[PDB]
Design a binder for this molecule. Structure first.
Ligand SMILES: COc1cc2c(cc1-c1c(C)noc1C)ncc1[nH]c(=O)n([C@H](C)c3ccccn3)c12
Ligand SMILES: COc1cc2c(cc1-c1c(C)noc1C)ncc1[nH]c(=O)n([C@H](C)c3ccccn3)c12
Lengths: 118, 118
């Protein structure tokens, strides 16, 4: 059972809003389907797949207990990409651009996490 | 009880080696002493403090079970910095530079994690 916090609210309504509509977002909006994309050994290499669609649903459904967990899912999504792919690949450059934006927005997130009731 | 893996070995001998000696590394090599630095409410805002000294010791002492845990400690260190400080602060620009290097190196880490025995 997760909860609503000021930081999670910010991650939803400011961070995810900036990322979801970005030019480079579309390949990250749903899980990597390795077989359709012809990606060998994707599930040997990546044991914790993650994508922005899953994160967005989790934010919408109060899945997270704390913003740190949501930020961990973002980090996992980006590092999965960096690990599976080559440093010069289009998808890695796209991920780097998205992560730069994510981290920039995190620098203006509310500082002290407090739960919101109603 | 942690273990030695090819990825943790890479994080130690390649990633931490590149970061530890960087021009901007020195403020990150030990925990943030908020009172000496005159940083109000540091421990209200940051509930999971982390630094490269602690990570380096953990790598040296086989504290981690998997590279994902070490990468999470790096991410926590950087996002702690971004959260406590302002987007334009010297320390945040320094952290961003270090994180760029960290993530660049992660893109060449061994892909499939396998434990090393002896
Ligand atoms: C080449 O990387 C991808 C390409 C994708 C994709 C997800 C990834 C992806 C992501 C994201 N993280 O690891 C991988 C692998 N999801 C959908 C999708 N649809 C689609 O046409 N692609 C191609 C192959 C693509 C898109 C962008 C950049 C490079 N290649 C892709
Ligand atoms: C202004 O930020 C810091 C300054 C530090 C520091 C750690 C931080 C720090 C870190 C790293 N993450 O959050 C904070 C706060 N550790 C040691 C240390 N010794 C030292 O003289 N400083 C000053 C205030 C400094 C250094 C670099 C950039 C800006 N300000 C610092």
């Amino acid at each position: 059972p997760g909860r609503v916090t000021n930081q999670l609210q910010y991650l939803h309504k400011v961070v995810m809003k900036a990322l979801w509509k970005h030019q480079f977002a579309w390949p990250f909006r749903q899980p990597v389907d390795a077989v359709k994309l012809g990606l060998p050994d994707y599930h040997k290499i990546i044991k914790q797949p993650m994508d922005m669609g899953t994160i967005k649903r989790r934010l919408e459904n109060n899945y997270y207990w704390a913003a740190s967990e949501c930020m961990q899912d973002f980090n996992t999504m980006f590092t999965n990409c960096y690990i599976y792919n080559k440093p010069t690949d289009d998808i890695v450059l796209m991920a780097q651009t998205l992560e730069k934006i994510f981290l920039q927005k995190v620098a203006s997130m509310p500082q002290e996490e407090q739960e919101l009731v109603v």
